[PDB]
Each structure stands twice: as structure tokens, then as C-alpha cells.
Design an enzyme around this catalytic site. Sequence first.
Site, mmCIF file in Angstrom:
data_model
loop_
_atom_site.group_PDB
_atom_site.id
_atom_site.type_symbol
_atom_site.label_atom_id
_atom_site.label_comp_id
_atom_site.label_asym_id
_atom_site.label_seq_id
_atom_site.Cartn_x
_atom_site.Cartn_y
_atom_site.Cartn_z
ATOM 1 N N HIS B 44 0.813 -1.199 0.000
ATOM 2 C CA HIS B 44 0.000 0.000 0.000
ATOM 3 C C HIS B 44 0.856 1.261 0.000
ATOM 4 C CE1 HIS B 44 0.252 -0.696 4.490
ATOM 5 N NE2 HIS B 44 -0.064 0.572 4.660
ATOM 6 N N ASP B 84 -0.570 -7.513 -0.033
ATOM 7 C CA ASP B 84 -0.084 -7.153 1.301
ATOM 8 C C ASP B 84 1.387 -6.756 1.492
ATOM 9 O OD1 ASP B 84 0.453 -9.968 1.259
ATOM 10 O OD2 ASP B 84 -1.264 -10.391 2.529
ATOM 11 N N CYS B 172 3.727 1.576 9.998
ATOM 12 C CA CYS B 172 3.673 0.532 8.983
ATOM 13 C C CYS B 172 5.058 0.141 8.520
ATOM 14 C CB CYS B 172 2.826 1.015 7.791
ATOM 15 S SG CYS B 172 1.162 1.672 8.217
#
Lengths: 216, 214
Positions: B44, B84, B172
Site C-alpha cells: 500500500h 499485502d 507501517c
Amino acid sequence: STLEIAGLVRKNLVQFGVGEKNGSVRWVMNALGVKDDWLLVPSHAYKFEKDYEMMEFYFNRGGTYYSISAGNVVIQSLDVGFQDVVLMKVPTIPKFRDITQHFIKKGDVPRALNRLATLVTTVNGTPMLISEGPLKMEEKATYVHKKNDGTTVDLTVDQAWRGKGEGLPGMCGGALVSSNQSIQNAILGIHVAGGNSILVAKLVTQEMFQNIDKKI
Amino acid sequence: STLEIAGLVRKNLVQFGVGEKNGSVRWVMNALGVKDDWLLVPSHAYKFEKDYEMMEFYFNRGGTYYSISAGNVVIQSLDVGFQDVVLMKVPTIPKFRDITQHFIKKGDVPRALNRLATLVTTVNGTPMLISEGPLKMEEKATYVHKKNDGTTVDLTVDQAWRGKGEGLPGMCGGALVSSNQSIQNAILGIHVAGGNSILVAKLVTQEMFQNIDK
Ligand SMILES: [Cl-]
């Protein structure tokens, strides 16, 4: 008690693997010993292998390794239709304690429907107990299986129990145990699939064991 | 111990940014070097930008920003997915110490289950250590994150660790370390998304790095 019957099951549960004689071995899931030299095995453990003729089966019985050629085992289907779980006779494995009279009788099935159950299994060798919600039954249920990495084929199971719970790859072959003491915490069947958040197992009754005591 | 493995993770953590060849760099999250010139990157971080034509990927390793063009990166999968976390080779970046053997083996996952873990990450250079609840595992986990700016996106994770803990934006890409001393406090995965009091991380095993060293 759930733990009493769980211990009986544990004593008969072995690691099942496949391969070539003198070559590589892939440990895949579990297989349950039921009586003398007979075991219950989910068919997808060997169905998608490239060559059945030169296939060798491997068992781990509490630290001792046994093996037998696929051309030397006797196989027996539980019912007619798609091969999902089979009975396999292995002469070179030590005698198993008879636990046949602990499985659920065909007639006692509704008394297990709607209640909780426990999956008694092992993951790569480590014992686990997974809790499953209120069991429902399906006349024929579908699931998806992946060949060792990659491709995904759809497979069905005939007369399947449905529990809600989270899996862990490698759990296949474990035994489902009912929490109903009224029916003496009967063994309901074998774990074959896990997916979204649903665990699927095939019903195995006391009546599927008759042909095993017959001579040839 | 947890501190020793946490130390190995910190030395391999870098910032990931996006930008043009002659402009300003937008830093977005962390990336983790695993071995040589390979890095674990949350997908992402880059998959929602649509002009790959002038896009450069940036990496801050020790105060110097190394880059590579979108049209030049080798990207590799862990199982089969790409939604992912992905492996990414950046030839220009200084070599990373090999930490692959500190990751958990597949057949040991049941021993990390139901136990606490610690998330080792950074937020703008700032080092953080976060305790995560008794870990649970899930086949697939869905999280809808406001990660961009004011845009909401669907982030779905395969074989994920779920645990109670608190977050912050930019965490993240950090790594999850097991508190279980009998499995040598193994690295269990990479932090993908977090929001209220739930943190989601992807499971990464030793076996998963077979794809790269060949
Ligand atoms: Cl520790």
C-alpha cells in the site's frame, strides 16, 4: 469427559507423509488409527501427487518411523461417490487399540446436531484442541484446496459437519469430539477443510467399520 | 532475548518515500532489509499512485536518500499474493546484514500463538517498542485504513497476526518479535495496518525467503 476421549484419540493419532523410497519426504497432515492395523486418512493427502505407482507412505508413531508402498496397502471407501476420507490397512504398523466403539452410531446423529464440539489434532507435531461452534450438517459441502503452492481446485465432502472457528494449516485428519456426555462424548468424524471462518469435517459412524473385521 | 532481536531489526529498518527525480520526496512508511539488497515492503506504500511514468522510489539509509525508478524495480512475492507485503530489490542501496534466520519456522507457529509479542518500529526516525496482546492468528483479515490523506482504502491480509495494542500513522513496515524464549524470540512478521486498539501484521516465515536466494 472431553479430555478422557481426547486422550484415547491422541494415542492413536499419527503424522502422515508421502514420498519416494530412498528419496524426499513431505509431511502433509494427520491420520487416525482405529483398530488393529487400520487407519482413517483424508484422500487429498495423496490424490494430487504426480505418480501413485511409485508412491511410498510414511508414518510417525510417537517418534518411530514406519513406511509402506502404496501398492501394498488395502484401501476401503466409507461410502459411494467422491473419495474424501478412506480406511487404509497398513500391515507393517504396530497394532492399534480398538476405539471403534467410541465413534457415533448412525442413529445417534441428531443428538449431536446443534451442539459444540472439539477438534483434537496436531500441527506439524504439536497437539492442539480447537473449539467449534454449534454444529450443523450438510448433505454435501464444498471447499477449496491448493496443491502445494499455486493452483486451487474445488473439492466436495459428502455428509459434512460445519463448525465456526479459525484454522491453522496442517490440521487435517484430526478427530471431532462432541461435548454431549449423554452420548458419551462420541467421536463425530474427521477434519478435512478450513476456510473463511468455518471448519468442515466428514461424518464417520460406527457402521462404516463393519467390512474391516471380515476376512479378505 | 527480545532486546537482542529488536536490535537486529532496528539496524535494517529504513524510510520509504515517493517523488520525482528533481523535486520533493514524500516519505510514507518503513521498509525492512532482510538480506543483501532485498527489502520487505508493504504494498500500500506505492500501489495507489497511477503515474508510474515519472515515479521514483526513495530510501533513506543513514541520512542519504537512494532511489530507483518504478520502471526499474524487481518485485517478488512471499506465497503468491502482492496485495499485502512484497520483497523489493534495490541494487543501489548499501548491503543489509542477513536476518532471515531469525524469522519463525512454519512448524513452530503454534508456540508463538497465545503469547505476547513486541513491535519494533520508527515514526520519523523515532524508535518505538510496543507490547501486543496475546497474539491470535487469522486466515484473512480486512482493515479499511485512512492511510493516504483523506482517502480510505481496503487492505486485506493473508495469514495475519492480530493483537491488542496502540498505534500511530507511519508505524507501517515495522517488525513483530515473539516474547517466547524457547523459540529464541523469533521475528513473526511485518506490521501492515493499525487503527483503534487492534494491530494487524502479516505472517512471514523462514521458508518464505526461498524465492530470493536463487
Ligand atoms: Cl525477553
